[PDB]
Amino acid sequence: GAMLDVNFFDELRIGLATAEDIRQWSYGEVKKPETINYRTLKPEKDGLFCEKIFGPTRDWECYCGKYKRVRFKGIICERCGVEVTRAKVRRERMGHIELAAPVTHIWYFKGVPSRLGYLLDLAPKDLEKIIYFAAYVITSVD
Amino acid sequence: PRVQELFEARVPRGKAPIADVTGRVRLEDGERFYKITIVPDDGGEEVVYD
Amino acid sequence: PGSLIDRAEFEAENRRVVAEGGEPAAGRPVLMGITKASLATDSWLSAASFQETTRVLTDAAINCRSDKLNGLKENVIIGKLIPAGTGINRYRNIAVQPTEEARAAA
Amino acid sequence: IPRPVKSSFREGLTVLEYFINTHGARKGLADTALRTADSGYLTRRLVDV
Amino acid sequence: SSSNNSVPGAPNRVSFAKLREPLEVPGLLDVQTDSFEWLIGSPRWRESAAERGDVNPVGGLEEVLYELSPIEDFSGSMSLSFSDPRFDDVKAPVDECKDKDMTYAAPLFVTAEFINNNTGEIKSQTVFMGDFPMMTEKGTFIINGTERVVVSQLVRSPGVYFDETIDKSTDKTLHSVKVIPSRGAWLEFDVDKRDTVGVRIDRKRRQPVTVLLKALGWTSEQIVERFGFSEIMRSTLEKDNTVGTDEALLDIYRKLRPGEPPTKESAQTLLENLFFKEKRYDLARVGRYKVNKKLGLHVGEPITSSTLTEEDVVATIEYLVRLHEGQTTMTVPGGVEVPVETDDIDHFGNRRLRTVGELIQNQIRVGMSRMERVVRERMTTQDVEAITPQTLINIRPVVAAIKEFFGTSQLSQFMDQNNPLSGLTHKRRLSALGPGGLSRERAGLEVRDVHPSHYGRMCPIETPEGPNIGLIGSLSVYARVNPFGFIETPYRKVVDGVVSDEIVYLTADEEDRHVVAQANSPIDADGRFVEPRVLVRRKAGEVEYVPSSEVDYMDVSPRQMVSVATAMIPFLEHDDANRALMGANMQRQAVPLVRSEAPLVGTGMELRAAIDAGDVVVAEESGVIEEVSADYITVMHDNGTRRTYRMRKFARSNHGTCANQCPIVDAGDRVEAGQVIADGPCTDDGEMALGKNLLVAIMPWEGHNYEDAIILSNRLVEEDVLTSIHIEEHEIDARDTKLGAEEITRDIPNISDEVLADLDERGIVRIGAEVRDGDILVGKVTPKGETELTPEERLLRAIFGEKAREVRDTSLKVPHGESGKVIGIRVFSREDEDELPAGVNELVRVYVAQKRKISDGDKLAGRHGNKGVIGKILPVEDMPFLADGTPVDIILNTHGVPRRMNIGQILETHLGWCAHSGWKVDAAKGVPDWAARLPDELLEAQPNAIVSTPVFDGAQEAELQGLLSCTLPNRDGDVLVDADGKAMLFDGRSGEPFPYPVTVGYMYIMKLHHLVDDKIHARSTGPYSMITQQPLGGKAQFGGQRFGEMECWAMQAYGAAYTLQELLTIKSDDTVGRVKVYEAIVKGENIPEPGIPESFKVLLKELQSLCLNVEVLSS
Amino acid sequence: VLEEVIAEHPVLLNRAPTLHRLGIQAFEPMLVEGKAIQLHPLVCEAFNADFDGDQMAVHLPLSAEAQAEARILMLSSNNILSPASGRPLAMPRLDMVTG
Amino acid sequence: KLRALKRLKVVAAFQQSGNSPMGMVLDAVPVIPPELRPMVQLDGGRFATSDLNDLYRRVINRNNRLKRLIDLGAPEIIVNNEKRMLQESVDALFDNGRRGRPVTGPGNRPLKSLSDLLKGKQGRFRQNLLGKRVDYSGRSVIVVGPQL
DNA sequence: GATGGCTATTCGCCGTGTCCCTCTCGCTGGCTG
RNA sequence: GCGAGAGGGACACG
DNA sequence: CAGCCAGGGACACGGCGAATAGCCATC
Ligand SMILES: [Mg+2]
Ligand SMILES: [Zn+2]
């Protein structure tokens, strides 16, 4: 539906988000545990604040500063890869972490009654043991 | 707290059972417990209490 | 069976299913507490903002429930005219123009 | 307290009678604060229901 | 003997007291000085302890070291020990430390002893042990420049406590215990619903006690032998279902340590170490005394073996079961018989007082435990015979613990000093909450009550009225702290019906063991009561009447129950507890005025409460005044030595008030030791003076004084009766920035030159310069940032080599609603070799003072809880005036008096008029009957004759009526106020008199620190929160008034949809809408339609961040 | 000029806790010397406000709809009876009743 | 029958809806934008704890360590322990302290997970959406105005 | 002897008023010249 | 321009 | 040693809802 979120709302739905949606939302992928450079105090590249992932900290200024003016808007620097635009886009553009292995959402597991357990007909204790690498499970026996 | 438990539809902490059928009553005054029975006029059953 | 549904919806569904085979659902009146009767409103946003945010939010997510945004607290969060008083469409859309006599008298 | 206090505030209470009065006074104040919190919660619940 | 005589320069404050005071009030700041001196080991503590227990003289640090040492390896090849805790002289004096942001501390030196065993040698040094903060002369620690007070805490003493819980589901009482140590493991010996008994170790899912009995090594036959009377214990024995001591040991091990392989030696070591090795289980000396007393095991044995013993445990079990049976008194083998009773965890015998010394000792013990961990760990790594204790001891954790206690702790409270009374009362305060104590949410509705054991140990009146009632209190006037921690109280022992003067101090236990009579009992001038029946306090707090044969103890005097703040309320026994509490709380809030007239009606507590508050400068040794000036008072002593007391003029207190001290002596006066040489903020010739006496009328005047509003006369503004100096402090620091350094200069980016007129050549403004909102106080600039020159400008500048010279002006400007003279500029620079935070080059303080007059809305309150803002300040001409023509300075509503039961303001009014106009009882025919008990030299009193009514023994109603009967005329033949205390008042406006007489007198009212200039606020646009774009909050920033949930409910109730949308959309969060609204109003166009709040977008993004696909359907 | 604009421009006065609907009411402002919001005595019972140190917050409606709502729905003279049981709340009390 | 009714309450919720339950297990974890988790800098060079960036740092570190462990080639015990630690890190990120000990922060302060920004009286719903600060407002002490 | 199957007991989870003013402090450890 | 802690003010006795 | 890196448990209550614990019944 709406992306500018004008007051022409009609309905607000909330549902289980799958990995496809997660990688759809993100404008990049954070992979390094870096936030800000020590000396120049600038958003670290590929970090939790990188401009490529979330947008520029300065209005119409890329990381290498190849463009600085309003005349360049909506285009991407070909060297630093930052999209020159208003800094406000740092408030909306999300990221995503590509986990090496699958993980379980706590709300659907531990929140009593365990919805995951009810779906799989598993008591919460055995479910915790299974998820927390305490013992094996038989997925399909031929 | 009475208002709070009344608007919350709680089971009252001081429940006083009310009957469910009319008619004469066989009283069984219980000591340390109690017992009442109301002779039903449908005669269905004197719903016992304890 | 054993679930609680609004009486209006219950009667509507009974009258809808009476045709195409007579098997209306059997129901009984219930008296439910206020905390429960406000955490089961048909608007996951009001329930989420009210109390027990985790439970109501997560079960609404599982049910993929949709808010209609026509309550009184739901329209205040999103910043819209409350459906009450001067906010209802009977008055929000009232059109006013000078009368013809006074308009000519201008 | 079955004593009880027997001096009017004009006549002036004694030390022990004043001490006995402090019980009820402080009890009233603390009760007032807790009851305010509870009634606030009840008002919120009613407004939301 | 009227007046407080044992103070040299006492103003002759005649008193109405009928009972002599056997015991003068103690050193009100002894509770803190004694404690910190105990921690230091100061000589006073040493010799006093020798006077009262010379067997065991040990200071706090000495005890900590002795408990800690020796420190030895597991192999046992060496050990380390400490001794000789020595304190050097303080590095800098008190005022210097306060000014220069320096903590007022002294170095600590402790000598080590590193003993070796494999070869044999002992190593000793003098080890620097951090800058231990040092208590000042009053009780306040100067920490990082500020002044802090470590409030004494109330804790439940470790020991044994038995309590009974009624089983509602079964109507069977269950008795249980809670053996609660210090720094140990809890454990319960309880009874379930059934006829069994449970044991919990560290609170582990109960267990039949038997597994423990056999575990300690007690056989079934011997268990039966020890419990050969209780049916319940033989029943349990039948139900033990466990044979073998080792079986119980391993079962308990598996229970406490699931998954750990149980074994015999491991269990034997563990179960013993849990409760019998002093390392991890040590109930302190107080705990051992409590256990011994409750079980009566050891009487003459000294305090040794603080840890538990199996005998104590079995004594606890047998006492528990005997109590369950219903026994009254019990006898233990090898121990005196003791009563069988349940213990209450609020009785002040079971509730001890961790004063300052014990708290700092606990923090030092924690730091030293960490240090011992570190030293023992590094012992292994370091090779033996090659290292020294100086190289072993790492002092960083200990100094860190000290710093994190004094700073940022819940008991190292910021000093609450705006008047001497507040500073005095913050000390002696007992805060029931803190580390190791219950918090507000955890605090119930029984711990906050007034237990009958509070009498004489904790004031029942004074306490905060917010969410702190009961938890925070204050010590009574006469109360003294026992060495163990309990709060003692003096008592006059009565022997053979004679009330001797042999004062003896009793704790709660001794108090309730014996029987105590009331303070105001009519002794026949020889120690024998008049009437047989006297009002007596019995054991369990009961009050009854007893013949004068069983009375065993008597209160030293009335006002033994009240604190210092409440003792200053005249006619307290006529006020109610609510309004007395309010008055006691408000006496700590008065701002110091400029004149500070003493009260006409007061108490003997003003003088002592003033000289003990500390600010009143007092001569330590007698002498003859040599020189006097505003800045110094130089006294010449009897023998050679001269001392120039340095006055403290215009010093900012912690809460912004003034701290002026003015001399009250001349060059020729001779002054005895302990005499008040100079006054403080709120002191008038020695005695406390928190406010002024104004003429008060008690009629409702034209509704301006409606519902607690007060109307003053313009005289109070003309003559500066109620005006106070308030000093505000502003701070700015120039610091090394990324681009360079920050400099403060008169040269500043574009601004009209007139503002530079007040600034001096080097930034900061000049002394004595008036400033207002928006004026510059410190001309400051910082590098603007990276900037771009115009390309032609840039090439020309490269040719020049010129600097950018950009900078951006950011100077200290006063907040909105501030103005006044500039007092002092205090400059700190690295060039002057001072201590500044790293990265800061310059740091300058500017003081700005303002003489705040009294204005509309400023809060005024008497002493009996008659608070009220100032509704209107009428001119002098239109004010009710007596026949003499004196206007009434203030008018109080009459409807607020009767329904609050605070009828002491009326009696204070009457006695104030009697004192102002004087009196003379007609002693022509003997004396009037009502004056029979009146002290001599009270039958006459000249005008402005200050008097005093002690708290619970003062002027009676009959005496007030009599004194109003004779109220000698002012100047002519005329009695303005007749015998009823009322007067004929002439209206100021209509001219005609009010048809009925009005109650007029003099009331001591005060100026509370709730002035309007500090309260008013207005915002139309200001800073915004970056996280959510709502406006900021508070008056410090601009901030906007919150529109909470309840206000929105009210708006919805009205049905005002558009106003609610306005308040929630474009006034707060519509980041794209606020600018449009500003422009529309400026240009006069129609308001634009609101958009969507930014906060809702934040909620949306967060829901999305929780893996909840929240999408918006347009249709 | 301030007076010129402030004439005929309502402002909402509120006192926390806003227990009931009358907690927030619209008053016609006027400039007054001093620094205290002079409040009409008869509305005190509506606000539960006594003058022993209370404080009140003032909000300014901006749009024509907001001003109309303040003038019509919420004006103090238009809110005399309580919304709970209909008993009056703007009546004289205390000093007025005694007089 | 009763346990069956509850299990139906769930499975039917999944059956009627067009969304599969596979969303419960997460291949990727979204990252809230940085401006909603800002790092304000306090004087002295010490950055105030935003309280989310540290949980994200923990998750990133554990994910990187797991990646390098699978690349290097490690036994089942170590890699499974790593997977458990990654589980716990994402766990604390989504809901701190819900299972096991909460992820403690500096000074024995438990951290604030994304859920704590909703749940509680200080969440967005209760604190920043129903009632919010407003511009064009002021306050002052009130006095009686009997002539008004 | 185990599944059904009813009543009781633990044990976690959720909640516990509004608005405002002031003040003070904000985690700990290693490589290396 | 956030968090924690402390203190404080205002809140029906028929 | 500091710039620049980085890595051991306490007084709260009341109510609701789910998972067991213990006891009688039947194949
Ligand atoms: Mg008030
Ligand atoms: Zn670029």
Curated annotation (Swiss-Prot), chain A:
Q: Where does Zn(2+) 1 bind?
A: C62, C64, C77, C80
Superkingdom, according to UniProt?
Answer: Bacteria
Similarity-based family: Belongs to the RNA polymerase beta' chain family.
The function of this protein is: DNA-dependent RNA polymerase catalyzes the transcription of DNA into RNA using the four ribonucleoside triphosphates as substrates.
Quaternary structure, per UniProt, is: The RNAP catalytic core consists of 2 alpha, 1 beta, 1 beta' and 1 omega subunit. When a sigma factor is associated with the core the holoenzyme is formed, which can initiate transcription.
* Protein name (database record): DNA-directed RNA polymerase subunit beta'
Q: List the taxonomic lineage.
A: Bacteria, Bacillati, Actinomycetota, Actinomycetes, Mycobacteriales
What gene is this protein translated from? Answer: rpoC
Curated annotation (Swiss-Prot), chain C:
Described by its record, this protein's role is as follows: DNA-dependent RNA polymerase catalyzes the transcription of DNA into RNA using the four ribonucleoside triphosphates as substrates.
By what name is this protein known? DNA-directed RNA polymerase subunit beta'
The Swiss-Prot or TrEMBL record describes its family as follows:
Belongs to the RNA polymerase beta' chain family.
Subunit comment: The RNAP catalytic core consists of 2 alpha, 1 beta, 1 beta' and 1 omega subunit. When a sigma factor is associated with the core the holoenzyme is formed, which can initiate transcription.
Native source species: Mycobacterium bovis (strain ATCC BAA-935 / AF2122/97)
Q: Which residues form the signal peptide?
A: none
From Swiss-Prot, chain E:
Q: From which domain of life does this come?
A: Bacteria
**EC?**
2.7.7.6
Going by the UniProt record, its keywords in alphabetical order are: DNA-directed RNA polymerase, Nucleotidyltransferase, Transcription, Transferase
PROSITE patterns in alphabetical order: RNA_POL_BETA
**Gene Ontology CC entries for this record:** DNA-directed RNA polymerase complex
List the Gene Ontology MF annotations in alphabetical order: DNA binding; DNA-directed RNA polymerase activity; ribonucleoside binding
Q: Name one GO biological process term.
A: DNA-templated transcription
InterPro entries xref list? DNA-dir_RNA_pol_bsu_ext_1_sf, DNA-dir_RNA_pol_bsu_external_1, DNA-dir_RNA_pol_su2, DNA-dir_RNAP_su2_dom, DNA-dir_RNAP_su2_hyb_sf, RNA_pol_bsu_bac, RNA_pol_bsu_CS, RNA_pol_bsu_protrusion
**Reaction catalyzed:** RNA(n) + a ribonucleoside 5'-triphosphate = RNA(n+1) + diphosphate
Q: What does this protein do?
A: DNA-dependent RNA polymerase catalyzes the transcription of DNA into RNA using the four ribonucleoside triphosphates as substrates.
Q: Cross-referenced NCBIfam families, in alphabetical order? A: PRK00405.1, rpoB
Q: Which HAMAP family match?
A: RNApol_bact_RpoB
Report the family membership. Answer: Belongs to the RNA polymerase beta chain family.
Cite the PANTHER family for this sequence.
Answer: DNA-DIRECTED RNA POLYMERASE I SUBUNIT 2 (PTHR20856)
Quaternary arrangement and interactors, per the entry? The RNAP catalytic core consists of 2 alpha, 1 beta, 1 beta' and 1 omega subunit. When a sigma factor is associated with the core the holoenzyme is formed, which can initiate transcription.
The protein's name: DNA-directed RNA polymerase subunit beta
Lineage per the UniProt record: Bacteria, Bacillati, Actinomycetota, Actinomycetes, Mycobacteriales
